DNA sequence: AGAGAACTTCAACAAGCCACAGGCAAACGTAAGCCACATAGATAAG
DNA sequence: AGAGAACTTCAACAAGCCACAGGCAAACGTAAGCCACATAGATAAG
């Protein structure tokens, strides 16, 4: 049970040996820090101890094809083994899910994201079922649902309407998912509404044009080396694409203004206002933290919806320090939010926020709809229920910086039989498909020019095993 | 020398746990196949036996920055230890170096490439020295000269008369190299000649874009799934893409014609005469074999370009069934050869081809010029039918007749001919160590691309330079 | 030339106690300056 | 009462020889997948 520290001589031998390895095989440096690699260290040490130093190492080495075959097989056995746990989680309505479709840049396959979210014990579950490519049939949503049910049948799950789905507004996706409770992706809604608000205000375009010319010059003239922070592009696919350029402008301000002064580019900066930049940064920092709080995986994010409304309507409300253009922007933002966000928000969002222990947030008319939905869900999952609802109205809870609604409800689960189960059912719902596009990002990470011959089954096997190893290993 | 065996259960758990690691680490399956991999495994097994089982790993395994420090230290140690042998190679007049420029695609740095080749003992050493940054200077021949002097003085080299260069016709390239040896790149010149040949024949202009649009239609519309040898686009930055794409289209002709029949787009393929395609492939087969001949490094390639001139003039000889368009193409190709190839040739290639044991092939003024050049060099490097003298060495080598054996390698032939012709053999080992073109530079760039990656940004230039140098050293001095 | 066997007579060593003080000899204290590997932050690709 | 010391007799009895029955782990030929490595080969990119 006690590790035996060795003399530094074997240590130096290890250092030189691994330097030779890293140079010869030409691998990224951090691969030594891989925890699985450290497990390899333990395994080879023990086999050396139990067989000596006069062994045949080579015959113990398998072939990579056998590696791939064993990977796919073990994927099959482990997915079969966890099918039972997933079915148990689904039956009690404890599970939610998000989906999307992904494409690479080499073969352009129609890969679909299948992620299942729920909660077990005191760890918030979040599972990636598998990325199955649709192949090439006109990318029809009919084939999408066919392959979807093929995926679900791999775990013996044939019911979907009870699963709560948080997805964006893809036409075919929403068309097919109208049979399911469709929740708009809060992050995607924020990005789209922000883009709509920006496109309604040309009064920022002229400094935007100047900044775009600045960044083009920076990526062209090759002068980023003397900034300590290289300028970034927009990349509209990137979330909060304006925030990154606002940062790379305001933060680098001193160095960039000095180098444009010393490079004879005073023309590039005569059309820029600092006050507007600082006001917009002060407005957009809240938006960035809304993004990060709505992209939380190991924490519930559906309870953020109405506090997000409060924070936005406080931020978007006109102030004294705004310009006429900025006040016009704020009015446009108010119009867009009232026609999109609150228009599309519905009973699920307010009800999921309601279970937060300070239930005095929405003392307005929304309590009626929230109570009706709570009664319906109590029937679905079924001290009395309405008595529970009334006694919850008697509860007052003080916020603390480390307070969690989940632990609070579970410690009140001893007092409340089924409303706590309702809370965990609602708390297991992220407010966005951030996990879905992160799965897409991971798939992009595993794909590369040298990896253009991979098979789809191998890919979804790898990602499922990675998710299982992340979530159910202690 | 006997080796032992483990239980099958041990092998099974090895499979299980290595799969666990690789799925956790998300690494390509080629990693286990590495030779350094099994080297480290053997070291681990030896240490585990020597130390037991309840031996800690966490303390033993170092930190990545420690690794970078140790790699730089080992690189500089090998630099110091090998600079002396490399200097001996420098003044043994058998050294060949590569020079080029390359820009990154993430940070867009400017890098000057220097490597070195030499022959010692029964092996041709191929060492990649360094791809050093030019910082952000004006990128002139002065910065290039400073960088190359710094590169070589890092290995205690200050004179560059003996070194022999092969490179392209860049502006700075022709600007700086006027003071030392210069040879034009065979690959760059060959690609330029192919582009000229296809440009000067107007009749074959439209099939190029026709085939490119065919590939584009089969690409963008997700039309590559049922194609056995799927088509790909040009990527003209590469070498002879057009012929390879045409070959692939000719290969898949059956699939594509039935696909057009089933899809009602037969008008896409009916616009091209197939006989044109067979004519193109029949002409270009010898060209592609020449392509594959010139790229050799572990075997000589400088000397195998004039016999490629022989092969071209054999191919460029007029045919009977060649269309008038094909006759125009071949006449234009002959003109391009006359105006480019012999224009860019130097005495290096003639001297390299001369050492072919049946020297009777080039019995012209060429061998006389080669004799004068070799006599000058040997007077610098130092009828009597015994070798005795360099002039008599050439006189005796002239009359030699050797069979065209199929498995003939001139390397060991001259190695055992050094007993007969010592100084001429030294000239041979000097000449053969020169690749004809700069394909090694692109190989080094490919290695860099294996190093530099979208996720592998933000690496110091000295670090990567040491990595590539040490890797080349190991591929030079490890048995 | 035996042979066993016990006896005074010197008188002659000798193992067996102490007294004790003088090493060299194993092992524990500071100190100690070169390392040098371990510990937290920006930062580009995303 | 006792001495200490050699013969004399059955004697039986616990050491070694012997070696046909009954028994057993060890060795060998066979056969069924079998199945996990091992081979080239191609296929894209670079």
A105 touches strand D (CB under 7 A): no
Q: Do B64 and A4 touch (CB under 8 A)?
A: no
Distance from CA of A17 to the nearest CA of B (A): 7
Cα separations (Å) of B406 from A216, A450, B402? 59, 37, 12
In angstroms, rounded to a whole number, what is the distance separating the alpha carbons of residues A209 and B237? 34
In angstroms, rounded to a whole number, what is the distance separating the alpha carbons of residues B198 and B240? 11
Classify B112 as helix, strand or coil.
Answer: strand
The spacing between the Cα labelled CA in B11 and the C1' in C14, in angstroms, equals 77
Burial class of residue B261 (count of CB atoms within 10 Å of its CB; 0-12, 13-18, 19+):
exposed
Q: Which of A204, A197, A186, A182 lies closest to A271, judged by CA? A: A204
CA–C1' nearest nucleotide, residue B61 = C37
Burial class of residue B325 (count of CB atoms within 10 Å of its CB; 0-12, 13-18, 19+):
middle
Dihedrals φ, ψ of A95, to 5°? -120, 150
Q: B151 is written with which tokens?
A: 């590169």
Q: Which of A38, A136, A445 is the closest to B61 by Cβ?
A: A38
Burial class of residue A184 (count of CB atoms within 10 Å of its CB; 0-12, 13-18, 19+):
buried
**Across the strands, what pairs with A126?**
A117
Radius of gyration of chain B (CA): 27
Is the distance from CB of B437 to CB of B166 less than 8 angstroms?
yes
In angstroms, rounded to a whole number, what is the distance separating the alpha carbons of residues B353 and B355? 6
Q: Do A17 and B52 touch (CB under 8 A)?
A: no
Q: How far is CA B24 from the centre of its chain?
A: 37
Three-state DSSP string of B42-65: HHHHHHHHHHCCCECCCCCCCCHH
Helix (H) or strand (E) holding A167: strand A164-167
Is the distance from CB of B316 to CB of B360 less than 8 angstroms?
no
Q: B253 is written with which tokens?
A: 């002709």
B135 — alpha (psi -120 to 50), left (phi > 0) or beta?
Answer: left
Handedness of CA A217, A220, A223, A227 (dihedral sign): positive
Q: Which of B237, B364, B249 lies closest to B310, judged by CA? A: B364
B100 marked ligand binding residue: yes
**Helices and strands (H and E) in chain B: how many:** 19, 4
B83-88, Cβ contacts within 8 angstroms, sequence gap of 24 or more: B83/B155, B83/B156, B84/B156, B85/B120, B86/B116, B86/B118, B86/B127, B86/B155, B86/B157, B87/B155, B87/B156, B87/B157
In angstroms, rounded to a whole number, what is the distance separating the alpha carbons of residues A190 and B332? 63
Radius of gyration of chain A (CA): 27
In angstroms, rounded to a whole number, what is the distance separating the alpha carbons of residues B122 and B397? 22
Dihedrals φ, ψ of B196, to 5°? -60, -45
In angstroms, rounded to a whole number, what is the distance separating the alpha carbons of residues B345 and B184? 8
Continuous H helices in B301-421: 306-316, 324-336, 342-344, 347-354, 365-381, 390-398, 410-417
In angstroms, rounded to a whole number, what is the distance separating the alpha carbons of residues B20 and A169? 38
Q: Do A67 and B14 touch (CB under 8 A)?
A: no
Is the distance from CB of B184 to CB of B344 less than 8 angstroms?
yes
Q: B172 is written with which tokens?
A: 């700075």
Buried b or exposed e, range B69-105, using 16+ CB within 10 angstroms: ebbbebbeebbeebeeebbebbebbbbbbbbbbbeee
Buried b or exposed e, range B376-394, using 16+ CB within 10 angstroms: ebbeeeeeeeebebbeebb
Taking contacts as CB-CB distances below 8 angstroms, the residues of chain A near B48 are 44-49
Is the distance from CB of A173 to CB of A110 less than 8 angstroms?
no
Helix (H) or strand (E) holding B223: none
Q: B367 is written with which tokens?
A: 């061998």
Cα separations (Å) of B354 from A190, B185, B347, B424? 75, 20, 10, 11
B232 DSSP 8-state letter: -
Burial class of residue A385 (count of CB atoms within 10 Å of its CB; 0-12, 13-18, 19+):
buried
Structure solved via? cryo-EM
Which DSSP string corresponds to A14-32? HHHHHHHHHHHHT--GGGG
**Across the strands, what pairs with A97?**
A116, A165
In angstroms, rounded to a whole number, what is the distance separating the alpha carbons of residues B466 and B74? 9
Q: Which nucleotides in chain D have some atom under 7 angstroms from a protein Cβ? A: 36-40, 42-46
Burial class of residue A301 (count of CB atoms within 10 Å of its CB; 0-12, 13-18, 19+):
buried
In angstroms, rounded to a whole number, what is the distance separating the alpha carbons of residues A120 and A377? 20
Cα separations (Å) of A280 from A270, A335, B141, B152? 19, 19, 48, 54
Taking contacts as CB-CB distances below 8 angstroms, the residues of chain A near B27 are 27, 31
Q: Strand (E) positions, B142-217? A: 164-166
Q: Do A67 and B37 touch (CB under 8 A)?
A: no
The spacing between the Cα labelled CA in A326 and the C1' in D21, in angstroms, equals 116
In angstroms, rounded to a whole number, what is the distance separating the alpha carbons of residues A344 and A336? 12
Classify A236 as helix, strand or coil.
Answer: coil
Q: Which of A396, A395, A405, A354 lies closest to A375, judged by CA? A: A354
Taking contacts as CB-CB distances below 8 angstroms, the residues of chain A near B18 are 40, 62, 67
Given the structure tokens 């109590």, which residue do they identify? A378
Name residues whose C-beta falls within 8 Å of residue B342's C-beta, 6 or more positions apart in sequence: none
B127 — alpha (psi -120 to 50), left (phi > 0) or beta?
Answer: beta
Name residues whose C-beta falls within 8 Å of residue A91's C-beta, 6 or more positions apart in sequence: none
Give the up-direction half-sphere exposure of residue B394: CA atoms within 13 A in the CB hemisphere: 17
Distance spanning both ends of chain A, measured CA to CA: 19
B393 marked ligand binding residue: no
The spacing between the Cα labelled CA in A101 and the C1' in C9, in angstroms, equals 129
Is the distance from CB of B471 to CB of B385 less than 8 angstroms?
no
Helix axis angle for B422-432 and B347-354, nearest 10°, is 120
B240 DSSP 8-state letter: S
Distance from CA of A56 to the nearest CA of B (A): 5
Cα separations (Å) of A367 from A373, A398, A464, B156, B370? 10, 21, 41, 84, 101
Instruction: Output the known binding site of A for Ca(2+).
Output: 100, 168
Give the up-direction half-sphere exposure of residue B201: CA atoms within 13 A in the CB hemisphere: 26
Q: Which of A283, A288, A270, A287 lies closest to A326, judged by CA? A: A283
Q: Do B53 and A51 touch (CB under 8 A)?
A: no
Interface test with A, best of B21, B38, B60, B219 (most A CBs within 10 A): B60
How many residues appear in chain B? 479
In angstroms, rounded to a whole number, what is the distance separating the alpha carbons of residues B203 and B328? 9
B168 marked ligand binding residue: yes
A402 touches strand D (CB under 7 A): no
Give the up-direction half-sphere exposure of residue B156: CA atoms within 13 A in the CB hemisphere: 12
Calculate the dihedral angle through the C-alpha atoms of A36, A38, A44, A46, rounding to the nearest 10 degrees. -110
**Across the strands, what pairs with B96?**
B117, B164
Residue B475: other Cβ atoms inside 10 A: 13
Cα B288–Cα B294–Cα B299 angle in degrees, nearest 5 = 130
Q: Give the chain B residue whose CA is nearest to the CA of A442.
A: B26
Give the experimental resolution in Å. Answer: 5.1
């Amino acid at each position: 049970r006690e590790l035996k520290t060795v003399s530094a001589d074997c240590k130096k031998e290890a250092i030189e040996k691994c330097a030779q390895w890293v140079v010869r095989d030409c691998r990224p440096f951090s691969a030594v820090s891989g925890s699985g690699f450290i497990d390899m260290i333990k395994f080879f040490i023990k086999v050396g101890a139990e067989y000596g130093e006069h062994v045949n190492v080579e015959e113990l080495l398998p072939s990579p094809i056998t590696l791939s075959r064993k990977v796919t097989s073990d994927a099959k056995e482990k997915k079969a083994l966890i099918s039972r746990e997933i079915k148990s989680a689904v039956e009690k309505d404890g599970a939610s899910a998000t989906i999307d479709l992904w494409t690479d840049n080499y073969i352009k396959r129609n890969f679909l994201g299948v992620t299942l979210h729920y909660h077990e014990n005191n760890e918030l579950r979040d599972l990636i079922l598998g990325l199955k490519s649709l192949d090439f049939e006109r990318s029809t949503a009919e084939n999408i649902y066919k392959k979807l049910k093929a995926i679900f049948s791999q775990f013996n799950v044939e019911d979907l309407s009870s699963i709560k789905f948080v997805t964006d507004r893809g036409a075919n996706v929403v068309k097919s998912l109208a049979n399911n409770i469709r929740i708009n992706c809060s992050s995607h809604l924020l990005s789209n509404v922000l883009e709509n608000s920006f496109e309604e205000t040309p009064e920022l375009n002229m400094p935007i044009l100047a900044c775009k010319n600045i960044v083009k010059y920076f990526k062209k003239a090759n002068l980023q080396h003397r900034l300590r922070s290289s300028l970034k592009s927009e990349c509209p696919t990137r979330w909060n694409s304006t925030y990154t350029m606002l940062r790379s402008i305001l933060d680098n301000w001193e160095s960039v203004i000095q180098i444009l002064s010393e490079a004879g580019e005073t023309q590039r900066i005569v059309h820029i206002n600092k006050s507007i930049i600082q006001t917009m940064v002060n407005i957009l920092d809240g938006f960035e933290r809304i993004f990060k709080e709505l992209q939380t995986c190991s924490s519930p994010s559906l309870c953020f919806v109405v506090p997000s409304i409060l924070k936005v309507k406080e931020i978007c409300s006109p102030d004294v320090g705004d310009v006429a253009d900025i006040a016009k922007l704020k009015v446009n933002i108010i119009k867009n939010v009232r026609i999109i966000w609150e228009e599309n928000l519905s009973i699920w969002h307010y009800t999921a926020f309601f279970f937060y222990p300070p239930a005095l947030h929405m003392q307005q008319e929304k309590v009626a709809q929230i109570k009706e939905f709570c009664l319906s869900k109590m029937e679905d999952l079924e001290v009395c229920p309405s008595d529970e609802f009334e006694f919850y109205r008697k509860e007052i809870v003080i916020l603390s910086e480390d307070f969690k609604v989940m632990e609070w409800w579970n410690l009140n689960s001893k007092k409340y039989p089924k409303l706590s189960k309702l809370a965990l059912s609602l708390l297991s719902i992220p407010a966005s498909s951030a996990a879905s596009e992160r799965t897409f990002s991971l798939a992009g990470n595993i794909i590369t020019e040298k990896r253009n011959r991979i098979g789809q089954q191998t890919v979804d096997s790898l990602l499922f095993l990675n998710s299982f190893y992340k979530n159910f290993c202690k």
